[PDB]
Amino acid sequence: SGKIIGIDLGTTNSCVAIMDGTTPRVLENAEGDRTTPSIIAYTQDGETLVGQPAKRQAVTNPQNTLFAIKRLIGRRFQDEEVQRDVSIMPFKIIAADNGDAWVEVKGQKMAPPQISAEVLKKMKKTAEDYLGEPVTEAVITVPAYFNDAQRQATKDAGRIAGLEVKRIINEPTAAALAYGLDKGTGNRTIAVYDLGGGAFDISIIEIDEVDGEKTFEVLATNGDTHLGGEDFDSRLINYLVEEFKKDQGIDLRNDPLAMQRLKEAAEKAKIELSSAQQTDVNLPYITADATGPKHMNIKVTRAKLESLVEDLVNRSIEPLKVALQDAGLSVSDIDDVILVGGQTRMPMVQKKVAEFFGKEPRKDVNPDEAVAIGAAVQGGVLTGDVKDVLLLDVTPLSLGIETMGGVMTTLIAKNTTIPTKHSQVFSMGGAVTIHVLQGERKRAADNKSLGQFNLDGINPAPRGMPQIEVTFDIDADGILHVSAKDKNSGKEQKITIKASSGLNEDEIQKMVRDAEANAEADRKFEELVQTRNQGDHLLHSTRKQVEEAGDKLPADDKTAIESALTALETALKGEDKAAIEAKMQELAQVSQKLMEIAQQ
Amino acid sequence: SGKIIGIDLGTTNSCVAIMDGTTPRVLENAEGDRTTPSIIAYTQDGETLVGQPAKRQAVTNPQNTLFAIKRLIGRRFQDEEVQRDVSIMPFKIIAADNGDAWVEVKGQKMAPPQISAEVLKKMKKTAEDYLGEPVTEAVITVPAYFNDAQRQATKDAGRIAGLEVKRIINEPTAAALAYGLDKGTGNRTIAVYDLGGGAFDISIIEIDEVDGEKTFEVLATNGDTHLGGEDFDSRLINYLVEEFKKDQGIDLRNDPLAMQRLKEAAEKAKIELSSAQQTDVNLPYITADATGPKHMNIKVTRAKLESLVEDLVNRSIEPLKVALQDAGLSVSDIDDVILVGGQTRMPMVQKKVAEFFGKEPRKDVNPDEAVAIGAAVQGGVLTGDVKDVLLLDVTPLSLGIETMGGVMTTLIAKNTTIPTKHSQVFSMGGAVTIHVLQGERKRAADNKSLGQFNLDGINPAPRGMPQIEVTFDIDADGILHVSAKDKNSGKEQKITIKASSGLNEDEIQKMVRDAEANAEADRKFEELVQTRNQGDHLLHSTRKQVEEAGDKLPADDKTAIESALTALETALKGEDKAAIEAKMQELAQVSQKLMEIAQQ
Ligand SMILES: Nc1ncnc2c1ncn2[C@@H]1O[C@H](COP(=O)(O)OP(=O)(O)OP(=O)(O)O)[C@@H](O)[C@H]1O
Ligand SMILES: Nc1ncnc2c1ncn2[C@@H]1O[C@H](COP(=O)(O)OP(=O)(O)OP(=O)(O)O)[C@@H](O)[C@H]1O
Ligand SMILES: [Mg+2]
Numbered sequence A, B: 001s002g003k004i005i006g007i008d009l010g011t012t013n014s015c016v017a018i019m020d021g022t023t024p025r026v027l028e029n030a031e032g033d034r035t036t037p038s039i040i041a042y043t044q045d046g047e048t049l050v051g052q053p054a055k056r057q058a059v060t061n062p063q064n065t066l067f068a069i070k071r072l073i074g075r076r077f078q079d080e081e082v083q084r085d086v087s088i089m090p091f092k093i094i095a096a097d098n099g100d101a102w103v104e105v106k107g108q109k110m111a112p113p114q115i116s117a118e119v120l121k122k123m124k125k126t127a128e129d130y131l132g133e134p135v136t137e138a139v140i141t142v143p144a145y146f147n148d149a150q151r152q153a154t155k156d157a158g159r160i161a162g163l164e165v166k167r168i169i170n171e172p173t174a175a176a177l178a179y180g181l182d183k184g185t186g187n188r189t190i191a192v193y194d195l196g197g198g199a200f201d202i203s204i205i206e207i208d209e210v211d212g213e214k215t216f217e218v219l220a221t222n223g224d225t226h227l228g229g230e231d232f233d234s235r236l237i238n239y240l241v242e243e244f245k246k247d248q249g250i251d252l253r254n255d256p257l258a259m260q261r262l263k264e265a266a267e268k269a270k271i272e273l274s275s276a277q278q279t280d281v282n283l284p285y286i287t288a289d290a291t292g293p294k295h296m297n298i299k300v301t302r303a304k305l306e307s308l309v310e311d312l313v314n315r316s317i318e319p320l321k322v323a324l325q326d327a328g329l330s331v332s333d334i335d336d337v338i339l340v341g342g343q344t345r346m347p348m349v350q351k352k353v354a355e356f357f358g359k360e361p362r363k364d365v366n367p368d369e370a371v372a373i374g375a376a377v378q379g380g381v382l383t384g385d386v387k388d389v390l391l392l393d394v395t396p397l398s399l400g401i402e403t404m405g406g407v408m409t410t411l412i413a414k415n416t417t418i419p420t421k422h423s424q425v426f427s428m429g430g431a432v433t434i435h436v437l438q439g440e441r442k443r444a445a446d447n448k449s450l451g452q453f454n455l456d457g458i459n460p461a462p463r464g465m466p467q468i469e470v471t472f473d474i475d476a477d478g479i480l481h482v483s484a485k486d487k488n489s490g491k492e493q494k495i496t497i498k499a500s501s502g503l504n505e506d507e508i509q510k511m512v513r514d515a516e517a518n519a520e521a522d523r524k525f526e527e528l529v530q531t532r533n534q535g536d537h538l539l540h541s542t543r544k545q546v547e548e549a550g551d552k553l554p555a556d557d558k559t560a561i562e563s564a565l566t567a568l569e570t571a572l573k574g575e576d577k578a579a580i581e582a583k584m585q586e587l588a589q590v591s592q593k594l595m596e597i598a599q600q
């Protein structure tokens, strides 16, 4: 029921769009912005902030401001990428009971999906405000190269935000839909290069015309889910730290407030250098010595920046080679190169991509909104409102199992179209344990473990010829479902999953409840503000009452009202709701009383 | 020749669009933003900034940052509105030799069109970068309620920027084109309410289908060209100044630099109060005293903001009433209410407008981009690329002359469709002086003077019957042209204009050359920066050269190269281009010398 909204859930920024009849439309949030910072904050006085208001206070509240959670979602605490971030992020990353990467704020342990849910809730309310009705269904995006755990965790985030996730869509696939909607963009093969704040994807996509309908088929995809603008910032931040150290003999790294200011300045400097050739990093009072306060002032040329990050850019080119190889195409077969993501605005990035493909990328694709638009289009394909549009996507990673010898044995190859199904007999009745992994490496140890899937034996029985057949389904969301049955009896076999990543049903239900309690807490927190606004109205009117009385007002009555006015003003300067309400009440009584005497 | 671009030249922000085939497209500037701050700045070190770069340094450069020039363009120095701004604007506003309102930066006097030309040059370059070819033609927008001088001055800005202005288009008309392009928006009457950073317009516009073509006709227009976001900011700033006086016993208004942080904080707070119901103005070390540093910390509620600006909002409602009366329509005749302009995002504005019309404004119009999109559409109509679209606009002000007794006598009534022409005999041969004005007031003294248009007599001659006929043409730009001839002989009569506002041909030609000189100077200023980049590249490579040599490098050689490196690094910290170039040459020589010794 209701509209299926399309939500680009980004590492850095999020964006929501709808189908406006036949045309997709990106919606402005309450702040009037077409994108929303993927930032969640908890204030000292216990408030939860999302988007711009959260971003604004990060500099003074670095420990309790959560950002880039998409780089933790669906990951394990002991993951190399996470272990590195543990030392870098200003907030506290911890291990959950099952070993998953979680965060801790003010003693409270939280799962990444709970945090991302807060962003999704804001995108949901954005759509609801615009539409004037409830929204309960959504298409949510994920990087094409997201693995099973990352996908499911993102889907879980949608549920926690109160959204039925009708489809998890791969981000380059969404961008392709947006690009291809334009009549006259058909029968061509495109390369979608998406470099965002956290992840990098490359997809090769064929747009065709079959039976009057436009078809989109992903031929191959590749990338790196932990390669993005955050990493460019980090290179620049480290440089600035080192230069200040050499210059002023002070190491800013143990100073949380300094490092937060530096992070902000570094990203601004990076962004400036996409258009200017030099930028100035200025941070007055960045620290203090026994000698007095110190100020950071350092010029950074584009040349310097490029030397600090060139290898990151080069890291994005290698998957391009694999994607083309997997697609069975050469650059010459690519009709259009499409850039998506804010980090593609870097001249070096554009130049490297153009040089690789031997052609200039298109300029007529919105790098901030194409993904959300495509998500909305996908929604409209689901609701039947978008006609003559079909898509066929793939799974990005080989699905395999660890077999005797510690080897990775592939069951479903990367770039297989989805949904897809593979069935195999694993046992003639004995108990079975299946170690399922995703990746292309030859050794199981070098791939991503999804878990151990255990089946009990089937007991011997006259005329029983047990054949335990295990089926591996990958759905339209790109998510695995393992089931089993005895072909001989047709009886379903229960699978017990051990050592897997992710939230269980009980946790999810609790986190759904917790999100609702947060919303209730938010409405509560608002009470004070509402009361403050009422106080200002009351002050405004009662001051007019004094003025209108002029001299007709007795000294004692005038003294009383003026005392009540000042007392309310003082209370409003404070944070005590009871005191404010009490002073409003007393002012109202004095106003009423004088009114009555005036009438006398 | 080339593409006709559409430029929304706004008080606060500017935006450029083109026809991308059959569809309008807004273009990102070099910074990657879809709109560009209408701000220019001159640094102490002699650099010119435009757009975001100028905006970013405004707070610390009060005197040499120019903004809101659209509020001065085409005005006289002794204008009430200008005289008030003189005391408020941080930059210097002076009287030009002809009494026009100009600005002065570092002793250099400049006309408003020269400043707006710099903004237009960036929008021009923005389009050129995107298209990959020169752009020499444009449609430029102006508020519907702009008078003759403001229109011409805006046209002159276009020329100074190197653009042929193919059309000056009224901003609500442009927004209507944008809205009405979408098939299925025909046969309706709309109200376009445009409240921006500086101007307010209301236009009532009929969209009809005639002979298979969509027609747009402005039925009535009204507004206030000096009512906008700047005035809302001003109300909040004045309130904060007064409160800080009471609270901390200090007057900030005598203080340029405190006022900059406050202006910026006030605008941010105002904007926050469009979504939140409270906002905190926090300005640490805002000023100093004999008691030490002072800090501003004041919470402002939405109720407070509304009480401060409600009369400005009411000021925007009164022209709506006149517009409907002039159009001969009631609110029930209006099918759609369209909001344009960032200042319409204020809830109180939306509520007052909805309540007046008795219906909710549409939500599917982009308040920041519709105007530029419409300008592009107008360009497409001109080139013939946009088919089956026709428009008919009006002049917003009655055109009259001062006649005997100091009375305003109307020749062309407000809301007359343009182009239009009025002709009249003024003399039977005697010399003639004609005082032309725009406005609705009974007394000429209360209207806007356009100048005195003078004609010499025609001498007595046998069989001569001089009939000096004067013609008042208003063109499609809404601009007046006065001409005269003797109907008896068909001979044109020279009109000498006195006491008129605006640039003469010689000034315009000079300013065009100056704009080109600025561009060359800006290209010349860049050299310091460009040399830095080369310096950094040189350092990067030569350092690798040292590393590669390892211990094989003799002490005296190692010492020589290490010294050359540090010397360049030191020079790069500096601001002396010659020194950098010298140290680069010296480093290049030692790099070469080592290279040659290594080969040996
Ligand atoms: N002009 C610019 N030049 C370089 N980088 C930029 C520019 N503008 C934004 N960025 C960077 O782009 C990144 C954000 O891009 P985007 O909003 O596309 O990411 P996202 O969709 O949230 O991330 P992801 O897809 O990786 O989850 C940030 O790292 C930001 O610093
Ligand atoms: N969310 C918001 N709430 C209130 N005001 C806002 C908001 N966002 C922007 N503004 C205000 O809108 C104004 C800028 O609007 P806009 O860019 O439409 O003006 P413009 O087109 O440059 O000006 P004009 O049309 O008057 O020449 C500024 O005064 C700014 O403070
Ligand atoms: Mg993205």
Ligand SMILES: [Mg+2]
Pocket (backbone or CB within 6 Å): B010, B011, B171, B196, B197, B341, B371
């Ligand atoms: Mg405007």
